[PDB]
């Protein structure tokens, strides 16, 4: 007799979705951000990207 355990399970999942979005223009803008711990950052946001 020669025993052996059962296998581990290996499952594969496949999912997916489709969406319809709309986006628009936007001029670039800037600001400076201050945060706790004396954090300071120069920020530039591209409202068109």
């Amino acid at each position: 007799f020669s025993g052996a355990p059962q296998p581990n399970q290996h499952h594969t999942l496949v999912y997916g979705k489709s969406y319809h979005f709309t986006i628009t223009n936007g001029l670039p803008e800037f600001r400076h951000l201050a945060t706790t711990n004396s954090g300071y950052y120069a920020q530039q946001r591209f409202k068109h990207i």
Binding site: K17, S18, Y19, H20
Partner: protein, 49 residues
Amino acid sequence: TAAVTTAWSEQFPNISASSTSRDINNPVIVDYSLPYFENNVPKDVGIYD
């Protein structure tokens, strides 16, 4: 009884669409049955799929 000649008219009570363009409106309706008091419901049909 008096088969006399009448005036021209574009006012066809109901001319066939086989003779001219005619508007129709038949939106498709999707039902989501709720037979029980607490039903198992799916997410709205993803028409883009």
